[PDB]
């Protein structure tokens, strides 16, 4: 039926929520747009990131991916890299980048496995400080151990397991390395949303070009990836709608606790914003798996206008 479970348990903190409900009218007036400009899908820009034969590029999503969380805060951290300022995302590949580049071997599990709060501090090095920089060092180091002592240094054995199955590769990531289980707790019930592990079956399916380690034959079973950008988009959109007192909260950058029944709500309905405009935008004449529809909305979310909501503050490993 619905095997990542995903969407099946999100759909009964949505039904439930406080602070957060759907705009269904804004789904369908944003599905009509979208499928008039005939929307292109994004691809994945592999110019952007580093480059290299399959074992090592598949442990580089691995690492990517076991990081690629939680980059906001003041003073914004920003990195320079030949001549241009990145932040975000955009820093956190360009640092990873910068450091292979320069001969930091990020792809042997060896080093991933001893790595320390002072290698990482170089890595990201630039203005401000990467938030969660220590949190991110036991991170990697939970990576580089498990990828020594379960898959001989490498990630390609994983995936290779998954046989193919997005959801299977899932499965195999969130079991295998810890840091991955993006899992919370609404109204005792498990909420599934495995943001990083989705993002990595992505990431692998772009960087390989559908081939290889990048080879999936149920991407369809991917959800959105439940961060603060896309639903930042959604809510600019104006398919997500907040409770006055959650407004408020994002309005003035207040910290918006991470398993908090707020956080959970957001997240919910990212998942389910998305499920709603792809179904939209079937009817409609233009089929797009959900991974696609959260590409194309996170792309929005670099063109914003000035004066839009800010995205949601959380302090967490999982986004």
Same mark, same amino acid.
């Given at each position: 039926?619905?095997?990542?479970?995903?969407?099946?348990?999100?759909?009964?903190?949505?039904?439930?929520?406080?602070?957060?409900?759907?705009?269904?009218?804004?789904?369908?007036?944003?599905?009509?747009?979208?499928?008039?400009?005939?929307?292109?899908?994004?691809?994945?820009?592999?110019?952007?990131?580093?480059?290299?034969?399959?074992?090592?590029?598949?442990?580089?999503?691995?690492?990517?991916?076991?990081?690629?969380?939680?980059?906001?805060?003041?003073?914004?951290?920003?990195?320079?890299?030949?001549?241009?300022?990145?932040?975000?995302?955009?820093?956190?590949?360009?640092?990873?980048?910068?450091?292979?580049?320069?001969?930091?071997?990020?792809?042997?599990?060896?080093?991933?496995? !001893?790595?320390?709060?002072?290698?990482? %501090? @170089? +890595?990201?090095?630039? &203005?401000?400080?990467?938030?969660? #920089?220590?949190? $991110?060092?036991?991170?990697?180091?939970?990576?580089?151990?498990?990828?020594?002592?379960?898959?001989?240094?490498?990630?390609?054995?994983?995936?290779?397991?998954?046989?193919?199955?997005?959801?299977?590769?899932?499965?195999?990531?969130?079991?295998?390395?810890?840091?991955?289980?993006?899992?919370?707790?609404?109204?005792?019930?498990?909420?599934?949303?495995?943001?990083?592990?989705?993002?990595?079956?992505?990431?692998?399916?772009?960087?390989?070009?559908?081939?290889?380690?990048?080879?999936?034959?149920?991407?369809?079973?991917?959800?959105?990836?439940?961060?603060?950008?896309?639903?930042?988009?959604?809510?600019?959109?104006?398919?997500?709608?907040?409770?006055?007192?959650?407004?408020?909260?994002?309005?003035?950058?207040?910290?918006?606790?991470?398993?908090?029944? !707020?956080?959970?709500?957001?997240?919910? %309905? @990212? +998942?389910?914003?998305? &499920?709603?405009?792809?179904?939209? #935008?079937?009817? $409609?004449?233009?089929?797009?798996?959900?991974?696609?529809?959260?590409?194309?909305?996170?792309?929005?979310?670099?063109?914003?206008?000035?004066?839009?909501?800010?995205?949601?503050?959380?302090?967490?490993?999982?986004?």
């Amino acid at each position: 039926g619905d095997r990542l479970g995903v969407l099946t348990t999100t759909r009964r903190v949505v039904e439930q929520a406080q602070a957060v409900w759907i705009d269904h009218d804004a789904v369908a007036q944003i599905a009509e747009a979208f499928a008039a400009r005939q929307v292109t899908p994004p691809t994945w820009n592999r110019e952007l990131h580093w480059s290299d034969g399959r074992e090592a590029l598949a442990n580089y999503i691995l690492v990517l991916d076991a990081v690629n969380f939680c980059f906001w805060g003041e003073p914004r951290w920003r990195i320079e890299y030949a001549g241009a300022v990145y932040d975000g995302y955009w820093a956190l590949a360009a640092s990873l980048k910068r450091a292979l580049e320069q001969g930091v071997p990020l792809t042997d599990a060896s080093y991933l496995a !001893e790595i320390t709060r002072d290698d990482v %501090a @170089t +890595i990201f090095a630039g &203005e401000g400080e990467i938030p969660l #920089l220590d949190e $991110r060092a036991r991170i990697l180091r939970e990576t580089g151990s498990v990828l020594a002592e379960r898959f001989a240094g490498r990630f390609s054995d994983a995936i290779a397991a998954a046989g193919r199955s997005a959801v299977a590769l899932v499965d195999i990531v969130t079991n295998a390395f810890p840091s991955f289980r993006d899992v919370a707790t609404y109204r005792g019930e498990q909420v599934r949303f495995y943001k990083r592990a989705q993002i990595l079956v992505s990431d692998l399916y772009g960087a390989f070009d559908g081939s290889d380690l990048g080879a999936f034959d149920d991407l369809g079973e991917l959800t959105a990836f439940a961060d603060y950008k896309v639903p930042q988009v959604l809510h600019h959109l104006g398919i997500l709608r907040y409770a006055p007192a959650l407004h408020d909260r994002l309005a003035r950058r207040e910290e918006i606790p991470a398993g908090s029944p !707020e956080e959970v709500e957001i997240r919910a %309905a @990212t +998942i389910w914003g998305v &499920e709603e405009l792809r179904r939209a #935008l079937a009817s $409609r004449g233009h089929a797009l798996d959900a991974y696609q529809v959260d590409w194309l909305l996170w792309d929005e979310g670099q063109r914003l206008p000035a004066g839009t909501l800010p995205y949601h503050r959380t302090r967490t490993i999982f986004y």
